[PDB]
């Protein structure tokens, strides 16, 4: 049981924080990612090969070059960033409409739930237009990457939903 995971999202969403919280079990000081990080993590008998690819606008055209072989997409959203939730929607749907991503299941980490006015999962699901995705499974998992809350719950959903 291996699954290849691609982890995408706007800059500052918390992708790299997630990758190393899972990998090292620690909260690390990150640099904005301009290329990619990749680690493998084993959980509940599954070896997840997780690709963390930079999300700054100039490098989003590079995301598609990691799609082949992807079995699950993790799309990470900053739930405090209301100003950019619409942009996140647009990027999500661009990813999942690529022919190379058609079969990938989709875990949304509704991240930074610890921040004051943070949008909750129900709001996130509606603002990302997730109900328009009717041909693969998807799930919104609230998370706080810094504390680790929600992260293993998300990996459990991935485990339960790929076959």
């Amino acid at each position: 049981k291996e699954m290849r995971i691609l982890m995408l999202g706007l800059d500052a969403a918390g992708k790299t924080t997630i990758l190393y919280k899972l990998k090292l079990g620690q909260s690390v000081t990150t640099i904005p990612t301009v290329g990619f990080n990749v680690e493998t993590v084993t959980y509940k008998n599954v070896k997840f090969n997780v690709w963390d690819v930079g999300g700054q606008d100039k490098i989003r055209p590079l995301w598609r070059h990691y799609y082949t072989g992807t079995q699950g997409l993790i799309f990470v959203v900053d739930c405090a960033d209301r100003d950019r939730i619409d942009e996140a929607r647009q990027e999500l749907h661009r990813i999942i409409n690529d022919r190379e991503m058609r079969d990938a299941i989709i875990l949304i980490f509704a991240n930074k739930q610890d921040l004051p006015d943070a949008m909750k999962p129900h709001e996130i699901q509606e603002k990302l237009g997730l109900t328009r995705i009717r041909d693969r499974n998807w799930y919104v998992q609230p998370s706080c990457a810094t504390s680790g809350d929600g992260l293993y719950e998300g990996l459990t959903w991935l485990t339960s939903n790929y076959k």
Binding site: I31, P32, G35, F36, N49, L62, H65, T68
Partner: protein, 187 residues
């Protein structure tokens, strides 16, 4: 999908392993003083006013052949009695500098393929030790190399690097194909 690239570097393999790979100059700068990395491919290629490497450089240069990396070594690392040539798999944070900068590539004889953000240790196939300028030893394989990560990936196509060329704002390239489609406002 399974070509290799070659990087002359004075840092030994154990140092590279500890750093997590071949990191760009700007990474330590960011951590040490908060400076954002410069991901203008043109600035990486031209370097500093004096022609040196910028402190905030976001890219790591590689060569397209062993012979070429040895030349880099004998030019830039001539002062080092021992250095290494790292053999690296291809991945999509890598750009062919002459292809992205086109005719405006400032040092086209470099034939540089550059990795935006650095090269993870798992992407390193192995290394040649160079002693007194001679490759006298067989390749040493990196046990930490993960071929399944990279064998299905290639370098980024030039079309997806044009937006990263990062010519200065008034530069004429922004009024020409292909960069016109990524031009900054007013350029």
């Amino acid at each position: 999908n399974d070509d290799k690239l070659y990087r002359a570097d004075s840092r030994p393999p154990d140092e590279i392993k500890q750093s997590g790979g071949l990191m760009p100059r700007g990474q330590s700068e960011y951590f040490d003083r908060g400076t954002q990395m410069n991901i203008n491919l043109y600035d990486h290629a031209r370097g500093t006013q004096t022609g040196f490497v910028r402190h905030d450089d976001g890219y790591v240069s590689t060569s397209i052949s062993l012979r070429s990396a040895h030349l880099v070594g004998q030019t830039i690392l001539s002062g080092h009695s021992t250095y290494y040539i790292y053999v690296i798999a291809t991945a999509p944070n890598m750009f062919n500098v002459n292809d992205v900068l086109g005719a405006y590539s400032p040092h086209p004889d470099d034939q540089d393929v550059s990795a935006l953000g650095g090269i993870p240790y798992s992407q390193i196939y192995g290394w040649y030790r160079v002693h007194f300028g001679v490759l006298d030893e067989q390749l040493h394989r990196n046990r930490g190399y993960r071929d399944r990560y990279y064998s299905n990936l290639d370098i980024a196509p030039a079309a997806d690097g044009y937006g990263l060329a990062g010519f200065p704002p008034e530069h004429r390239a922004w009024r020409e194909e292909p960069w016109i489609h990524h031009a900054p406002p007013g350029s």
